[PDB]
Amino acid sequence: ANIVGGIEYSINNASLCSVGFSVTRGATKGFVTAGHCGTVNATARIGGAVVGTFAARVFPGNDRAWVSLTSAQTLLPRVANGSSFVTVRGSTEAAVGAAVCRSGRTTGYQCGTITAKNVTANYAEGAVRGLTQGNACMGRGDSGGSWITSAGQAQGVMSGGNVQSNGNNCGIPASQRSSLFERLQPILSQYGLSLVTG
């Protein structure tokens, strides 16, 4: 499979999540995603084919994971935006007030702005601390997907937010959305990964 930020993948033939970013760890290919999407050793599938397994994750507390892929997968420095693509150029962290977009299998590519950092989400499983908050909308299934600026600086992966009864927070105003992402920087250093860029 071609690995692009934002596409769907399933875990153990049950849950769906979105790919965050293509990365490498020495000769190993992988992608970063949300920790809540899978447990260590869970199987990831793209379009019904096995592409790899969860190599590590932290959830709750943090919400991060990386999936190690088989050698036949093609890593690309890109994030899906409809039929188009955003090129990944690095991981400079943007500040509060910056515009950012996110990509995922449920709501597609949505943009907004960063409104706060260091937010705590109180999920049913336990608190997840240090998340950054944006006001781009998102829906169930978007988890693990990319958060990136239009300039190509990868920001983090989708964690969660105030989903309404229709499964997303797209039908409420930007001012009332809380869409939280886990910062990419600490995931790359915790697992020794390097981002694929173009």
Binding site: A34, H36, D63, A121, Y123, A124, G160, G161, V163, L180
Partner: peptide
């Protein structure tokens, strides 16, 4: 908030 809920995970996703």
């Amino acid at each position: 908030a809920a995970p996703a």
